[PDB]
Design a protein around this nucleic acid. Structure first.
Ligand SMILES: [Zn+2]
Length: 627
RNA sequence: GGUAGCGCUACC
RNA sequence: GGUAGCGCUACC
């Protein structure tokens, strides 16, 4: 498996010592080409060091076993990830090795760390290998690393590392023009300090009924200028926008009504994508888990519950599913020869369409074993899977145990399955990058491609940049570098201005649901510049410990996640605990509180935007004061 | 779970 | 530029 010609030509500018972006197609072999640059770099000098910056946890160990292990004959290589983080300090481990393969935020933490053993600098490395370098933009981690690289470069710093970008698609960044597509590429060159870009229904009475129920509730609200466009992204914005204002001002009738009206609008969007029965069970389980406001809204649903369940059972009113069933009936006979993936927008659509397959008479008979594949992220509406669960299902898919998937956009890019031969993009509305990447998952000879929906530049830009004059290129890039560093200082100063407005004691925290005051801003401390905990011992009266302890797949260095916590009076979710070494501490989520200040009452979503200074937590300080 | 990031759609 | 929804990701 010796290098090809195009690989050798692509790395040529990197070997001379220049900052480059190696643009090659997906799966051409950018990682093997990087290894050759790394060996040729480390062979050429002493005190040489490499940081390989991936952007996914799986890519740390993938690069090692597939590619970078070959370098171990001459040079020490070590892998650092999220899962194996808590054992050793990075500063020691990185300085002890010749090559360090890690997710970018590990290095960024090490670059900011206060502890001398965990500390690191940019000057400590002499070749950064930023894999998928096109992400180096805006306020991403990649870009914040490289933005410090530029701030130092422009202040007369020397011996900053060689930059080596790997990427398949630099992209446009939402630019359909030719003028804009070039300017986008010139910014990414300025971010990475790059010098040479190298390359080779008719009737819907279920839906119509749900709209009428929302009209009755908006009449009960008694308000003018409400939005009259039900079952839309505009309505879901406006109803939550009103719910946010109702929470800030504390208007109980408007706040409780707005939460329910969204649940009806969610059902309208669930009804549009998948079954009528899926839209019904969203509202069913909402009211089942449960003042005059909630009593009216409970009675409003109770009358329409029996009707909507009959309308959902009606087979006259989804044509999408009848179309989907005919594709599955045809292609999966013989029983389990084919191998398909069905792309959906939401996790709720993915989890619904699996249960549809199980509750259908025509498809049961053909041996189709299937499952759902989503991400590891999370929110209050929907939960996801994990990296361990995803990899089990991908294995069972690859070796023919399971032969169908209802996946989200998790696996549209990256997932290689040689035996796959079917793709069904179910009612999506994405760009042609997401379209062409989705088509490529079927790796088989005679690959099918269906686009199940309802009835009724970059390549030129890169070559234009590659063919620029050297003087014009260097004068443009130095302008864009000076721009971003000035934009950074303005944005950090502007953030510092808003942070120093009020005092900690002047700022009070209220419960988002019931508006009872609970604590002051002086009580709060940040643990690792992230977790905001109340150190006042009298705070423990206000929160109650609801459920058992939460379990993640990972372990941390200093602390571990305790039980959840809720409001003593109204049982609203506040956050969770932190069992920091030997002391419990209450973690707070800003989403579940209305922060009162001298000026205004606001419903903050981020802790970065708060208007009072918050000090760093000290374990030595808290133990001394409490004991 | 907590803190961020990005992409897509939608309105302002 | 602001916000919300959804999807993906990272660190802790
Ligand atoms: Zn409360």
């Amino acid at each position: 498996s010796e290098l090809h010609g195009y690989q050798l030509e692509a790395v040529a500018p990197a070997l001379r010592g220049r900052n480059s972006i190696v643009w090659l197609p997906t799966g051409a072999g950018k990682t093997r080409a990087a290894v050759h640059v790394c060996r040729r770099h480390l062979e050429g000098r002493r005190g040489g060091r490499v940081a390989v910056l991936v952007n996914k946890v799986h890519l740390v160990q993938q690069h090692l076993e597939k590619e970078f292990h070959v370098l171990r004959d001459a040079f020490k290589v070590t892998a650092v990830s999220g899962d194996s983080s808590h054992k050793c300090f990075f500063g020691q481990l990185a300085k002890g090795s010749d090559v360090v393969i890690c997710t970018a935020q590990i290095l960024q933490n090490a670059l900011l760390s206060g502890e001398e053993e965990a500390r690191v600098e940019l000057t400590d490395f002499s070749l950064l290998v930023i894999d998928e370098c096109h992400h180096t933009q805006k306020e991403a981690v990649y870009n914040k690393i490289m933005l410090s690289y530029l701030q130092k470069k422009l202040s007369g710093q020397r011996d900053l590392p060689q930059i080596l970008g790997l990427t398949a698609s630099p992209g446009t960044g939402g630019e359909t023009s030719f003028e804009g597509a070039v300017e986008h590429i010139l910014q990414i060159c300025a971010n990475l300090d790059t010098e040479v870009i190298a390359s080779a229904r008719e009737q819907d009475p279920f839906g119509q009924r749900l709209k009428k129920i929302m009209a009755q509730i908006q009449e009960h609200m008694e308000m003018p200028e409400l939005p009259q466009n039900f079952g839309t992204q505009v309505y879901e914005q406006r109803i939550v926008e009103l719910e946010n204002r109702a929470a800030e001002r504390f208007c109980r009738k408007t706040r409780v009504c707005a939460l329910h009206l969204r649940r009806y609008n969610d059902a309208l969007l669930i009804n549009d994508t998948v079954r009528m029965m899926d839209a019904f069970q969203c509202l069913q389980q909402f009211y089942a888990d449960k003042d005059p406001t909630e009593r009216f809204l409970a009675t409003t649903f109770e009358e329409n519950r029996a009707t909507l369940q009959a309308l959902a059972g009606d087979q006259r009113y989804n044509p999408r599913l009848s179309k989907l069933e005919e594709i599955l009936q045809e292609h999966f006979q013989p029983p389990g020869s084919s191998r398909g993936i069905v792309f959906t927008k939401t996790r709720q659509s993915a989890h619904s369409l699996l249960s549809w397959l199980q509750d259908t008479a025509g498809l049961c008979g053909q041996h189709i074993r299937a499952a759902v594949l989503t991400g590891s992220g999370h929110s209050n509406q929907a939960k996801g899977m994990t990296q361990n669960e995803q990899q089990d299902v991908i294995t069972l898919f690859r070796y023919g145990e399971l032969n169908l998937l209802f996946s989200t956009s998790v696996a549209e890019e990256g997932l290689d399955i040689p035996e796959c031969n079917i793709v069904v993009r179910y009612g999506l509305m994405t760009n042609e990058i997401a379209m062409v990447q989705a088509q490529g998952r079927a790796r088989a000879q005679n690959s099918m491609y269906s686009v199940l929906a309802k009835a009724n530049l970059m390549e030129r830009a890169i070559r234009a940049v590659q063919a620029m004059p050297e003087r014009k290129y260097r004068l443009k890039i130095v302008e864009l570098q000076r721009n971003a560093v000035l934009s950074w200082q303005v944005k950090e100063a502007r953030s510092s201005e808003r942070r120093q407005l009020h005092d900690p004691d002047d700022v009070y925290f209220h419960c988002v649901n019931c508006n009872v005051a609970v604590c002051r801003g002086s009580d709060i401390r940040t643990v690792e510049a992230m977790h905001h905990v109340n150190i006042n011992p009298n705070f423990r009266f206000y929160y109650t410990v609801s459920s058992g302890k939460i379990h993640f797949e990972r372990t941390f260095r200093d602390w571990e996640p305790g039980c959840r916590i809720v409001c003593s009076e109204c049982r609203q979710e506040w956050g969770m605990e932190m069992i920091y070494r030997n002391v419990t501490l209450p973690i707070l989520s800003i989403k579940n509180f209305v922060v009162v200040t001298p000026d205004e009452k606001k419903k903050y979503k981020k802790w970065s935007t708060v208007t009072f200074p918050i000090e760093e937590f000290s374990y030595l300080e808290y133990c001394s004061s409490t004991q």
